[PDB]
């Protein structure tokens, strides 16, 4: 039975690959050839948010585009006021090994997690004045790699174990669980409509899930190595990825295949983060080499470089407003570029 | 007014500095090892579905945070990136075992990791007493797993522990060499391995960890000050 079933799987895989071949009448470079290149993009560090003691392992902008939470391996979440660099909060984490942090879209909550396998929810607006652990979402059997709020009550998380899960914060239960990967799920990105989210894993495959139904809809496998970063194109029909193989890929949900790949053979460092600009014309990416490259999303070439960090760039985020970019690093500084 | 916000920011900065003082004075240690090894009892020996277990212990008035990784997936390629820039890695292996080849592969992967290339390993060859009675038993012929042991002799620079058989010393130092030759192959002076033979109950395990951390910090400052 096993051989026959695996051959049936191979047959369906061949059908999918042939469909992708048929849909590949042209490449993005052919379509975009007529368009005007962005030129030399140059950005300067407008703010340098210092105060973290250890590697800044994650960051996330608030929807207000001014406040940004930032997780450090020393066990601190600092909510920064980027406009003035004031520290609005300094939340002492229970587990020092925090690998991710999220900012609720309403700004009421922040989440964080890591090697503790527990996603702690923090309430920023309690009557008591301080910041307290609203919930401790436990149930993962591996380190928490990423987490993103759908709303103040629903949070979707990825784990070092094979699974990715959706939680209800009121009860602390898993509303649904996602399976289908084989390696560690390394990143999440939430679609603007919040009905879909895409996750990359150590198996070098990116999978599109539906939160409402709890199943994988389609899979993408254009990477030779594991995927460390993932981000949705603002339109919500395409998403970029970053891998240890040091090249980004752009995938389209409706075309069900890769559209473009960004690489420069002298770049051999893996990619740690990815993010589109508000228009989607720029595709910023962080690298194990201590700088970020601003790729032009439509014409795959390095439009600029953000070289201002003394160590690995670990996180990167463009404000929902799009005014500025923020990058964290293992040197324990966040620098806002614009 | 925003001036009150700036005052709050400065108070938070003061608290962050007070936390930094504690952070720098403490030495972080990552405890790794195969399940058959006694790391789980070594942590419990400290006399001071969750993941990181944090053990706090102090020797000669310097603090130590030993992290046992607990529940994770089998392969550690990714999450061990976090444990960069720890003071040292305490890799614990069961010498009485054959799991020895698996432990050697596991130490090869840890040692040659691209991120742990500046982290010295305080290698613990745990369960030396079980190894002793396993060698004296004779039935467990280590040679059939390691044919090289048929043609190995204890080196001139080795010193036997008081009251030990020649065969047990030969076997234990052979295992020591089997780890040391992995350590020497790829470490270009950036990180060092410190083998030890231990039983989990030894009160000297913490003392050995303290002395090795002393040497590791000495080397770190020596390289920082351009003396090497």
């Amino acid at each position: 039975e096993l051989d026959q079933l695996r051959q049936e799987a191979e047959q369906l895989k061949n059908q999918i690959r042939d469909a992708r071949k048929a849909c590949a009448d042209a490449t993005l470079s052919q379509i975009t050839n007529n368009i005007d290149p962005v030129g030399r993009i140059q950005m300067r560090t407008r703010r340098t948010l210092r105060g973290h003691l250890a590697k800044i392992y994650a960051m996330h902008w608030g929807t207000d585009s001014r406040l940004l939470v930032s997780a450090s391996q020393d066990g601190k979440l600092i909510i920064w006021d980027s406009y003035t660099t004031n520290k609005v909060h300094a939340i002492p984490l229970r587990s020092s090994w925090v690998m991710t942090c999220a900012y609720a879209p309403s700004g009421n909550y922040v989440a964080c997690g890591g090697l503790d396998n527990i996603c702690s929810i923090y309430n920023l607006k309690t009557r008591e004045g301080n910041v307290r652990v609203s919930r401790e979402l436990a149930g993962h059997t591996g380190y928490l790699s990423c987490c993103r709020f759908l709303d103040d009550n629903q949070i979707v998380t990825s784990s070092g174990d094979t699974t990715c899960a959706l939680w209800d914060i009121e009860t602390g239960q898993q509303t649904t669980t996602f399976t289908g990967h084989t390696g560690d799920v390394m990143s999440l990105s939430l679609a603007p409509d919040t009905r879909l989210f895409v996750s990359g894993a150590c198996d070098a495959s990116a999978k599109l899930w539906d939160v409402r139904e709890g199943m994988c809809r389609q899979t993408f496998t254009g990477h030779e190595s594991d995927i460390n970063a993932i981000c949705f194109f603002p339109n919500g029909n395409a998403f970029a990825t970053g891998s240890d193989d040091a090249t980004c890929r752009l995938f389209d949900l409706r075309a069900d295949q890769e559209l473009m790949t960004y690489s420069h053979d002298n770049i051999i460092c893996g990619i740690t983060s990815v993010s589109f600009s508000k228009s989607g014309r720029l595709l910023l990416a962080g690298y194990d080499d201590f700088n970020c490259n601003v790729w032009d999303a439509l014409k795959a070439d390095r439009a600029g470089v953000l070289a201002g960090h003394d160590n690995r760039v670990s996180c990167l985020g463009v404000t929902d407003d799009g005014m500025a970019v923020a990058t964290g690093s293992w040197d324990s500084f966040l620098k806002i570029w614009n | 007014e925003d001036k009150a916000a700036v005052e709050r920011s400065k108070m938070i900065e003061k608290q962050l500095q007070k936390d930094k003082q504690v952070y720098r004075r403490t030495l972080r240690l990552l405890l790794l090892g195969a399940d058959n090894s006694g790391k789980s009892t070594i942590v419990k020996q400290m006399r001071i579905t969750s993941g990181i277990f944090e053990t706090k212990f102090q020797v000669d008035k310097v603090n130590f945070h030993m992290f046992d990784v607990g529940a994770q997936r089998d392969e550690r390629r990714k999450w061990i990136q976090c444990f960069n820039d720890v003071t040292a890695i305490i890799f614990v292996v069961d010498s009485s075992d054959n799991r020895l080849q698996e432990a050697l592969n596991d130490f090869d992967s840890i040692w040659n990791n691209r991120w742990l290339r500046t982290i010295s390993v305080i290698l613990f060859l745990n369960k030396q007493d079980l190894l002793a009675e396993k060698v004296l038993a004779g039935k467990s012929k280590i040679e059939d797993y390691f044919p090289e042991f048929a043609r190995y002799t204890t080196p001139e620079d080795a010193t036997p522990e008081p009251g030990e058989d020649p065969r047990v010393t030969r076997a234990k130092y052979f295992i020591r060499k089997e780890f040391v030759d992995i350590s020497t192959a790829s470490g270009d002076g950036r990180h060092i391995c410190y083998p030890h033979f231990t039983c989990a109950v030894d009160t000297e395990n913490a003392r050995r960890i303290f002395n090795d951390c002393k040497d590791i910090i000495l080397q770190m400052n020596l390289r920082e000050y351009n003396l090497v």
Partner: single-chain antibody
Amino acid sequence: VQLVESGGGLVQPGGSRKLSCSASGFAFSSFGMHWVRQAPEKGLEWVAYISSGSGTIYYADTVKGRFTISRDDPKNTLFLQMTSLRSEDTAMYYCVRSIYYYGSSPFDFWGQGTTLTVSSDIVMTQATSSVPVTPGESVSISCRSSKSLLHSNGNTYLYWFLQRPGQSPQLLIYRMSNLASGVPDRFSGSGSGTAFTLTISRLEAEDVGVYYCMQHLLTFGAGTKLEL
């Protein structure tokens, strides 16, 4: 969340007293503390302020040096020592909570208050001291400022309080547009930066009271009564 004051009573101008308040149910250390006096048949007056961590202190001109404000975070107690009293000091004294950061709501909570019996600033003017009204109909409370409150940073520092008879003031709107926690949607705020408005669309039976405008570039308005 409770702020209970201690002291008060009879004083002759040749005497002295210490006002005290105890904080319960919240992190007193993080909050800056204000003292606000409710003089008999009069509006509110700001007395003194001490920031979080005691790093900043301010006093009213009438009281600058005449009284001294103190604070003990470990015991969650706020003190206001009154060295030389005079007739102007007779009033009910409220300890007022406040915290300052982006998006915070200063003056969110007011203490129960204690009464003391005794033998340039931005002048705030409210449209009228009283307005007959009935529940269910909309009404607008209006006030004007000595100068524009629209600070360069891009927000207007105006606060609207409702002192229900027999109760401490409640914060309705802070920074001219933001409803405070627990405030029903009935209320709303608007302003041009130098003239300001507070609208209650569907006045409830519980909305009876005096409405106080305040600026925080501290001065309160004369208070507008809604005679139900």
